[model samples]
Structure formats: structure tokens, C-alpha cells
Target: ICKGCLSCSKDNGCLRCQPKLFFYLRREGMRQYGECLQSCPPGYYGVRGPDMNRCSRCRIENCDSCFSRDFCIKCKSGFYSHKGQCFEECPEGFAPLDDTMVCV
Candidate 1:
């Protein structure tokens, strides 16, 4: 386990991490370890709590990155972003703004 870990074992890594840091399982070669981070990396979201803070990857269609669950901040190529939701096409009266890739 890395720094900021509250409870951990050398063999199993961190069981819990300190407040203000999120726990993430890390793998290096044959070794499995835990890391504590202040913020979750991009393409992943943080699940926060008093004793449990985990980093979870985003799962959404056409979503490349996001701030929360099902709330995408960016979309895949040719997709449209509207209010954190990814759309294949802009809705009526809205169109893609190529510069920002957002539907407005």
C-alpha cells in the first residue's frame, strides 16, 4: 500500500484510505498494490464516503470522460454533448457547435 492508506497489509494492499484521498487498486507486473489519490484520474469517477473512497471507471455509450455517473463531460468522435449527456445527434432546435463539440 502507498501513502495515505489507513489500514492495509503488505500482501493485500490497502483496505481503507485516509480522508481526502481515494483508494485505487494498482497493478504492476505480478504485484497488486493500493494507491491513495486526492482526486480520481480522468475517465474515472470518485465514490466518496467517510471510510470508503474508491475510484471507479466510467461506463457509458459514446462517453470519453465524465464528472459523475452517466454525466459525461465529453463524447466520442462525431458525438454531441448536451447537459452532461452524450447524444448521437442534437435534439430539435439544437445543433452541434464544432468548436466545443456541444449541442446548443
Candidate 2:
């Protein structure tokens, strides 16, 4: 975690989603973030807001985020993109499969 007061300027990598703000998660962190989002048990998603209560799952199929049917790009290992969300597992030995998507 960063200790100092990090300021995200438009010229310095800052993305604002309404009242809340976020930065790009490192490639290593994407998988974890995807997993965290999936743990919501099928009706919610990690939306853009101040609520960090639990992983929110979506109610609709192929849904990765909230309020939309768009599939999120980030996903766990072995899982690849299906429809819009990541929903497949890679074979063994390939702990981190290369599904072509870069980790930002």
C-alpha cells in the first residue's frame, strides 16, 4: 500500500467514477480483484462507490458489473472471456493462463 498522500491528477493517472475515485490496479492485482468481485455469489459486483461491504454479484447472466450487462475485463486465473465476463478455467500447470488480455 502507498503510505504518502497520493494525488491523482488527470495528467498523473487519475480516474474518477462519480463521487469515488480509483486508479488502475497493477497487472498482479487484477486477478485478485476479479476473484473478489466473483465472490459476491451471483447478484452483485464491485461497483464504483464507497461501499466495500462485500463482493457484489450480478442478477443477470454474463454480467460482471453493476447496473449494466457489460462483462468486465478482469478475471481470475484459468478463467478467460466468455460472452462479456471471464468464465473459463485453464488446464493445470498453467496457473496463470495467457488469454491475450494484458494486465494494464
Candidate 3:
């Protein structure tokens, strides 16, 4: 019973899953099978936890507004966001001044 796959066999199971999609089953404890997904959702990222029952995820690092694990729409106070990504500190020749995050 896959969410994205066309059909799954109770006998053969999911042989050929969607492209780049990792086959997954129930969480830590469960009998029913799971589904397929290209990757984890936002706020968390990774594959399989310590139990190793299914795919796992982790919180994004210092992400003010996370679009995904690797992509942040906005950053926190000490961070800068350019092209939807967060930078802890401004690049060379750039500095934040005044009462705001003014990168110059």
C-alpha cells in the first residue's frame, strides 16, 4: 500500500519503486507496510533512526524558516539569508552594522 507507487504486490511487494524514491515501511513498531518518498520533509532530514525501522529525519540547523532540511527561507538574528539559504556570518568585505542586519 504505497502512497506514490502505482500499485504494490502483497506477494512480491514493491520491487520497482518510483525514481529516486526510497522504499519505506511503518515506523518503529507496526505490521502494515509503508510508502515511498523522494526525501524527508522540512524541519527534519535523514534516513532511518537508531532503531532502523524506517526513514528518519532531524531538525534543521538554526533555521528561522525552513523550507526543507537543506533550504531555509529565512535565518535567525546572527544569520544571513541569500537565495533562500542561511549564512551564519556575512561573507568577506561584508559586515552588519546599525540597528539592523545591514550587510555592506
| Candidate structures ordered by lDDT, highest first | 1, 3, 2
lDDT of prediction 2: 0.38
- lDDT by residue (tens digit), candidate 2, 1-104: 22121333333332222233222332333332111222334455545546322334454433344444465654444345444555444334333334463221
User: What ranking emerges by TM-score with the best candidate at the front?
Assistant: 1, 3, 2
Task: Give the range of the ten consecutive residues with the poorest summed lDDT in model 3.
Answer: 49-58
> In order, what lDDT does every prediction score?
0.79, 0.38, 0.54
| C-alpha RMSD of candidate 1 | 3.8
Off by over 4 Å in 3: 1-5, 9-60, 65-71, 82-84, 97-104
**Could you say which candidate leads in lDDT?**
1
TM-score of each: 0.65, 0.25, 0.35
Q: How would you encode candidate 3's per-residue C-alpha lDDT over 1-104 as one tens digit per residue? A: 54556567664455345555655654333544556667754443434434332344434456665555566655776776554555667687776667455456
- Model 1: runs farther than 4 Å from truth? 28-32, 76-78, 82-84, 91-104
TM match of model 2 to true structure = 0.25
User: Which residue pairs in candidate 2 have backbone atoms (N, alpha carbon, C) closer than 3 angstroms, thus clashing?
Assistant: 43-57, 43-58, 44-56, 44-57, 44-58, 45-56, 45-57, 78-90
For model 3, give the RMSD to the true fold.
8.0
User: What lDDT, from 0 to 1, does candidate 1 have?
Assistant: 0.79
Who wins the TM-score comparison? 1
